[PDB]
From a paper:
In this study, we report the identification of an aldo-keto reductase with 2-keto-l-gulonate reductase (Vv2KGR) from grapevine. Vv2KGR is able to catalyze the reversible reduction of 2KLG to IA, with NADPH as the preferred cofactor. Comparative structural analyses showed that Vv2KGR has a typical 2KDH fold and shares the highest structural similarity with plant hydroxyl pyruvate reductase (HPR).
The structure was solved to a resolution of 1.58 Å by the molecular replacement method. Twinning analyses showed that the apo-Vv2KGR crystal was pseudo-merohedrally twinned. Despite exhaustive co-crystallization and soaking attempts, no sufficient electron density could be observed for NADPH and 2KLG in the electron density map. The determined Vv2KGR structure has four subunits (chain A–D) in the asymmetric unit, which share high structural similarity. Each subunit is composed of 15 α-helices and 12 β-sheets, which are arranged in a larger coenzyme-binding domain (CBD) and a smaller substrate-binding domain (SBD). In the asymmetric unit, chain A forms extensive interactions with chain D, whereas chain B and chain C are positioned more closely with their respective crystallographic symmetry mates. This observation indicated that Vv2KGR may function as a biological dimer.
Residue numbers in the entry: 2 to 313
The structure:
Amino acid sequence: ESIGVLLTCPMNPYLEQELDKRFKLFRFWDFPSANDLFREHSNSIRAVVGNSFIGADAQMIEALPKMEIVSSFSVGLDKIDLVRCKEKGIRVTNTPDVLTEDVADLALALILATLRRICESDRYVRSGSWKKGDFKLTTKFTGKSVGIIGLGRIGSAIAKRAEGFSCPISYHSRTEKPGTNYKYYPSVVELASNCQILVVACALTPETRHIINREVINALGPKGVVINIGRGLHVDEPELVSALVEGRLGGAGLDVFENEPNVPEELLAMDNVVLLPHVGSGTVETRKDMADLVLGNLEAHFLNKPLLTPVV
Protein backbone atom coordinates (compact mmCIF):
# COMPACT_ATOMS: atom_id res chain seq x y z
CA GLU A 1 0.00 0.00 0.00
CA SER A 2 0.96 3.69 0.20
CA ILE A 3 4.15 3.02 2.16
CA GLY A 4 6.99 5.53 2.15
CA VAL A 5 9.60 4.55 -0.46
CA LEU A 6 12.71 6.58 -1.31
CA LEU A 7 13.87 6.55 -4.95
CA THR A 8 17.50 7.64 -5.06
CA CYS A 9 17.74 8.75 -8.71
CA PRO A 10 15.76 8.57 -11.99
CA MET A 11 16.56 4.91 -12.69
CA ASN A 12 13.65 3.88 -14.88
CA PRO A 13 10.35 5.57 -15.82
CA TYR A 14 8.23 2.42 -15.42
CA LEU A 15 9.71 1.59 -12.00
CA GLU A 16 9.24 5.21 -10.90
CA GLN A 17 5.63 5.26 -12.13
CA GLU A 18 4.74 2.02 -10.33
CA LEU A 19 6.40 3.21 -7.12
CA ASP A 20 4.34 6.41 -7.29
CA LYS A 21 1.19 4.32 -7.79
CA ARG A 22 1.68 1.50 -5.26
CA PHE A 23 3.62 3.32 -2.53
CA LYS A 24 4.17 6.79 -1.07
CA LEU A 25 7.05 7.79 -3.33
CA PHE A 26 9.80 10.19 -2.27
CA ARG A 27 12.11 11.30 -5.09
CA PHE A 28 15.56 11.97 -3.64
CA TRP A 29 16.21 14.62 -6.29
CA ASP A 30 13.12 16.59 -5.23
CA PHE A 31 15.21 17.70 -2.23
CA PRO A 32 18.07 20.21 -2.67
CA SER A 33 20.32 18.14 -0.38
CA ALA A 34 20.07 14.82 1.41
CA ASN A 35 19.52 16.65 4.71
CA ASP A 36 16.41 18.28 3.21
CA LEU A 37 14.89 14.79 3.01
CA PHE A 38 16.28 13.54 6.33
CA ARG A 39 15.11 16.62 8.24
CA GLU A 40 11.58 16.47 6.82
CA HIS A 41 10.86 12.73 6.45
CA SER A 42 13.35 10.87 8.67
CA ASN A 43 10.74 8.31 9.78
CA SER A 44 8.56 8.39 6.63
CA ILE A 45 10.82 6.08 4.59
CA ARG A 46 10.40 2.33 5.12
CA ALA A 47 12.01 1.22 1.84
CA VAL A 48 14.87 2.55 -0.29
CA VAL A 49 15.12 1.81 -4.01
CA GLY A 50 18.65 2.51 -5.25
CA ASN A 51 21.04 1.53 -8.01
CA SER A 52 24.77 1.55 -8.75
CA PHE A 53 24.85 5.38 -8.66
CA ILE A 54 23.17 6.10 -5.30
CA GLY A 55 22.46 3.26 -2.88
CA ALA A 56 22.12 3.06 0.91
CA ASP A 57 25.31 4.11 2.69
CA ALA A 58 25.96 4.21 6.44
CA GLN A 59 24.87 7.86 6.67
CA MET A 60 21.56 7.24 4.88
CA ILE A 61 20.78 4.06 6.84
CA GLU A 62 21.28 5.86 10.15
CA ALA A 63 19.32 8.94 9.02
CA LEU A 64 16.26 6.75 8.22
CA PRO A 65 15.64 4.72 11.40
CA LYS A 66 12.36 3.19 10.14
CA MET A 67 13.98 1.65 7.06
CA GLU A 68 13.03 -2.01 6.57
CA ILE A 69 14.34 -3.01 3.14
CA VAL A 70 16.80 -1.96 0.43
CA SER A 71 15.65 -3.11 -3.01
CA SER A 72 18.44 -2.40 -5.49
CA PHE A 73 17.89 -1.82 -9.21
CA SER A 74 21.21 -3.56 -9.79
CA VAL A 75 23.16 -6.76 -9.27
CA GLY A 76 26.01 -4.86 -7.61
CA LEU A 77 25.90 -4.11 -3.89
CA ASP A 78 28.94 -1.83 -3.45
CA LYS A 79 26.65 1.12 -2.59
CA ILE A 80 24.83 -0.72 0.23
CA ASP A 81 26.12 -1.06 3.79
CA LEU A 82 25.24 -4.76 3.87
CA VAL A 83 26.76 -5.43 7.30
CA ARG A 84 24.93 -2.51 8.92
CA CYS A 85 21.74 -3.67 7.20
CA LYS A 86 22.04 -7.09 8.86
CA GLU A 87 22.77 -5.48 12.24
CA LYS A 88 19.60 -3.36 12.11
CA GLY A 89 17.31 -6.07 10.72
CA ILE A 90 17.05 -4.49 7.26
CA ARG A 91 16.51 -6.80 4.31
CA VAL A 92 18.38 -6.14 1.06
CA THR A 93 17.46 -7.41 -2.41
CA ASN A 94 19.02 -7.02 -5.85
CA THR A 95 18.37 -8.12 -9.45
CA PRO A 96 20.50 -11.21 -10.17
CA ASP A 97 20.46 -13.28 -13.35
CA VAL A 98 18.13 -10.94 -15.27
CA LEU A 99 21.02 -8.78 -16.53
CA THR A 100 23.69 -11.47 -16.97
CA GLU A 101 22.99 -11.96 -20.67
CA ASP A 102 22.99 -8.26 -21.60
CA VAL A 103 26.15 -7.41 -19.63
CA ALA A 104 27.94 -10.42 -21.13
CA ASP A 105 26.72 -9.29 -24.56
CA LEU A 106 28.25 -5.85 -24.00
CA ALA A 107 31.64 -7.28 -22.98
CA LEU A 108 31.82 -9.25 -26.23
CA ALA A 109 30.77 -6.14 -28.17
CA LEU A 110 33.51 -4.04 -26.56
CA ILE A 111 36.07 -6.73 -27.39
CA LEU A 112 35.09 -6.73 -31.06
CA ALA A 113 34.70 -2.94 -31.19
CA THR A 114 38.19 -2.47 -29.77
CA LEU A 115 40.03 -5.25 -31.61
CA ARG A 116 38.36 -4.56 -34.98
CA ARG A 117 38.15 -0.76 -34.52
CA ILE A 118 34.47 -0.72 -35.45
CA CYS A 119 33.70 2.70 -33.95
CA GLU A 120 36.80 4.09 -35.66
CA SER A 121 35.77 2.39 -38.91
CA ASP A 122 32.33 4.00 -38.65
CA ARG A 123 33.83 7.46 -38.13
CA TYR A 124 36.08 6.66 -41.11
CA VAL A 125 33.19 6.09 -43.53
CA ARG A 126 31.01 8.96 -42.30
CA SER A 127 33.89 11.45 -42.53
CA GLY A 128 34.35 10.58 -46.21
CA SER A 129 37.88 9.19 -45.79
CA TRP A 130 37.07 5.85 -47.46
CA LYS A 131 37.35 7.61 -50.83
CA LYS A 132 41.08 8.10 -50.19
CA GLY A 133 42.12 4.53 -49.42
CA ASP A 134 41.45 1.39 -47.45
CA PHE A 135 41.05 1.62 -43.70
CA LYS A 136 43.98 0.38 -41.63
CA LEU A 137 44.21 -3.32 -40.88
CA THR A 138 43.06 -4.30 -37.42
CA THR A 139 43.40 -7.20 -34.98
CA LYS A 140 41.74 -10.61 -35.31
CA PHE A 141 39.60 -11.69 -32.35
CA THR A 142 39.08 -15.40 -33.09
CA GLY A 143 41.64 -17.52 -31.27
CA LYS A 144 42.92 -14.78 -28.96
CA SER A 145 43.30 -15.58 -25.26
CA VAL A 146 40.61 -14.17 -22.97
CA GLY A 147 41.32 -13.77 -19.25
CA ILE A 148 38.35 -13.12 -16.98
CA ILE A 149 38.61 -11.55 -13.53
CA GLY A 150 35.73 -13.24 -11.72
CA LEU A 151 33.99 -16.40 -12.91
CA GLY A 152 30.51 -15.63 -11.59
CA ARG A 153 27.28 -15.63 -13.56
CA ILE A 154 28.44 -12.81 -15.84
CA GLY A 155 32.03 -14.01 -16.09
CA SER A 156 30.91 -17.52 -16.99
CA ALA A 157 28.48 -16.06 -19.55
CA ILE A 158 31.27 -14.06 -21.21
CA ALA A 159 33.42 -17.20 -21.40
CA LYS A 160 30.64 -19.20 -23.07
CA ARG A 161 30.36 -16.56 -25.81
CA ALA A 162 34.11 -16.28 -26.37
CA GLU A 163 34.34 -20.06 -26.78
CA GLY A 164 32.30 -19.74 -29.98
CA PHE A 165 35.15 -17.58 -31.31
CA SER A 166 37.65 -20.39 -30.54
CA CYS A 167 39.09 -18.32 -27.68
CA PRO A 168 41.32 -19.91 -25.01
CA ILE A 169 39.76 -18.96 -21.67
CA SER A 170 41.56 -18.40 -18.35
CA TYR A 171 40.20 -16.88 -15.13
CA HIS A 172 41.26 -15.67 -11.68
CA SER A 173 40.24 -15.06 -8.07
CA ARG A 174 39.38 -16.52 -4.64
CA THR A 175 39.80 -20.28 -4.99
CA GLU A 176 39.90 -22.45 -8.10
CA LYS A 177 36.35 -22.87 -9.37
CA PRO A 178 35.23 -26.51 -9.71
CA GLY A 179 33.83 -27.88 -12.93
CA THR A 180 35.56 -25.50 -15.35
CA ASN A 181 38.16 -26.30 -18.00
CA TYR A 182 39.42 -22.71 -18.05
CA LYS A 183 42.94 -22.01 -16.82
CA TYR A 184 43.06 -20.80 -13.22
CA TYR A 185 45.64 -18.18 -12.25
CA PRO A 186 46.30 -17.46 -8.55
CA SER A 187 47.32 -13.85 -9.35
CA VAL A 188 45.99 -11.13 -11.63
CA VAL A 189 49.53 -10.28 -12.79
CA GLU A 190 49.99 -13.87 -13.99
CA LEU A 191 46.52 -13.90 -15.56
CA ALA A 192 47.29 -10.63 -17.35
CA SER A 193 50.71 -11.82 -18.50
CA ASN A 194 49.17 -14.91 -20.17
CA CYS A 195 46.19 -13.31 -21.95
CA GLN A 196 45.60 -10.59 -24.54
CA ILE A 197 42.02 -9.63 -23.55
CA LEU A 198 41.53 -8.85 -19.85
CA VAL A 199 37.87 -8.70 -18.76
CA VAL A 200 36.78 -7.23 -15.42
CA ALA A 201 33.75 -9.23 -14.26
CA CYS A 202 34.00 -9.22 -10.46
CA ALA A 203 32.17 -7.51 -7.61
CA LEU A 204 33.51 -4.21 -6.27
CA THR A 205 34.78 -4.72 -2.71
CA PRO A 206 37.78 -3.27 -0.86
CA GLU A 207 39.61 -6.37 -2.12
CA THR A 208 38.83 -5.72 -5.80
CA ARG A 209 39.23 -1.93 -5.79
CA HIS A 210 41.93 -0.95 -8.30
CA ILE A 211 42.40 -4.63 -9.17
CA ILE A 212 43.69 -3.35 -12.52
CA ASN A 213 46.64 -1.20 -11.43
CA ARG A 214 49.87 -0.14 -13.13
CA GLU A 215 51.45 -3.53 -12.38
CA VAL A 216 48.64 -5.53 -14.01
CA ILE A 217 48.50 -3.07 -16.92
CA ASN A 218 52.25 -3.41 -17.48
CA ALA A 219 51.79 -7.19 -17.39
CA LEU A 220 49.00 -6.91 -19.98
CA GLY A 221 51.22 -4.89 -22.29
CA PRO A 222 50.93 -2.85 -25.49
CA LYS A 223 49.42 -5.84 -27.34
CA GLY A 224 46.59 -6.21 -24.81
CA VAL A 225 43.20 -4.63 -24.16
CA VAL A 226 41.29 -3.94 -20.94
CA ILE A 227 37.55 -4.67 -20.97
CA ASN A 228 35.74 -3.20 -17.96
CA ILE A 229 32.03 -3.96 -17.52
CA GLY A 230 32.21 -3.93 -13.72
CA ARG A 231 32.80 -0.76 -11.72
CA GLY A 232 35.02 2.21 -12.51
CA LEU A 233 36.94 1.72 -9.26
CA HIS A 234 38.10 -1.72 -10.47
CA VAL A 235 40.73 0.09 -12.57
CA ASP A 236 43.29 2.64 -11.44
CA GLU A 237 41.84 5.12 -13.92
CA PRO A 238 44.70 7.69 -14.05
CA GLU A 239 47.14 4.82 -14.62
CA LEU A 240 45.01 3.37 -17.42
CA VAL A 241 44.95 6.72 -19.23
CA SER A 242 48.70 7.20 -18.74
CA ALA A 243 49.49 3.74 -20.12
CA LEU A 244 47.30 4.37 -23.17
CA VAL A 245 48.92 7.76 -23.77
CA GLU A 246 52.44 6.32 -23.47
CA GLY A 247 51.72 3.16 -25.47
CA ARG A 248 52.13 0.71 -22.58
CA LEU A 249 48.58 -0.57 -23.19
CA GLY A 250 47.12 -1.37 -26.59
CA GLY A 251 43.51 -0.36 -26.01
CA ALA A 252 40.53 -0.32 -23.70
CA GLY A 253 36.83 -1.02 -24.00
CA LEU A 254 35.28 0.89 -21.12
CA ASP A 255 31.65 0.91 -20.02
CA VAL A 256 32.28 2.25 -16.49
CA PHE A 257 34.46 5.05 -15.11
CA GLU A 258 35.66 6.43 -11.78
CA ASN A 259 33.44 9.52 -11.68
CA GLU A 260 30.56 8.87 -14.06
CA PRO A 261 29.30 10.56 -16.13
CA ASN A 262 32.76 12.15 -16.39
CA VAL A 263 35.23 10.48 -18.77
CA PRO A 264 38.90 11.57 -18.85
CA GLU A 265 39.54 14.04 -21.66
CA GLU A 266 42.64 12.15 -22.85
CA LEU A 267 40.54 9.09 -23.72
CA LEU A 268 38.16 11.13 -25.90
CA ALA A 269 40.72 11.57 -28.71
CA MET A 270 42.00 7.97 -28.79
CA ASP A 271 41.02 5.58 -31.57
CA ASN A 272 42.21 2.50 -29.66
CA VAL A 273 39.53 2.88 -26.96
CA VAL A 274 35.76 2.35 -26.97
CA LEU A 275 33.76 4.34 -24.40
CA LEU A 276 30.12 3.67 -23.47
CA PRO A 277 27.92 5.53 -20.92
CA HIS A 278 27.34 2.53 -18.59
CA VAL A 279 24.90 0.71 -20.86
CA GLY A 280 25.57 -2.84 -19.63
CA SER A 281 22.00 -3.52 -18.52
CA GLY A 282 20.39 -0.78 -20.62
CA THR A 283 18.05 -2.73 -22.88
CA VAL A 284 14.27 -2.50 -23.08
CA GLU A 285 13.96 -6.18 -22.15
CA THR A 286 16.39 -6.31 -19.22
CA ARG A 287 15.40 -3.01 -17.61
CA LYS A 288 11.77 -4.18 -17.63
CA ASP A 289 12.84 -7.44 -15.97
CA MET A 290 14.88 -5.55 -13.36
CA ALA A 291 12.00 -3.16 -12.61
CA ASP A 292 9.51 -6.00 -12.13
CA LEU A 293 11.97 -7.74 -9.79
CA VAL A 294 12.41 -4.67 -7.56
CA LEU A 295 8.63 -4.27 -7.40
CA GLY A 296 8.24 -7.98 -6.70
CA ASN A 297 10.61 -7.80 -3.73
CA LEU A 298 8.92 -4.73 -2.22
CA GLU A 299 5.48 -6.32 -2.58
CA ALA A 300 6.58 -9.63 -1.05
CA HIS A 301 8.27 -7.82 1.84
CA PHE A 302 5.36 -5.59 2.88
CA LEU A 303 2.91 -8.50 2.45
CA ASN A 304 5.00 -10.60 4.89
CA LYS A 305 5.83 -13.03 2.07
CA PRO A 306 9.27 -14.54 1.37
CA LEU A 307 11.45 -12.24 -0.71
CA LEU A 308 12.31 -13.06 -4.31
CA THR A 309 16.05 -12.25 -4.61
CA PRO A 310 17.38 -11.55 -1.10
CA VAL A 311 21.08 -11.13 -0.38
CA VAL A 312 20.99 -10.60 3.39
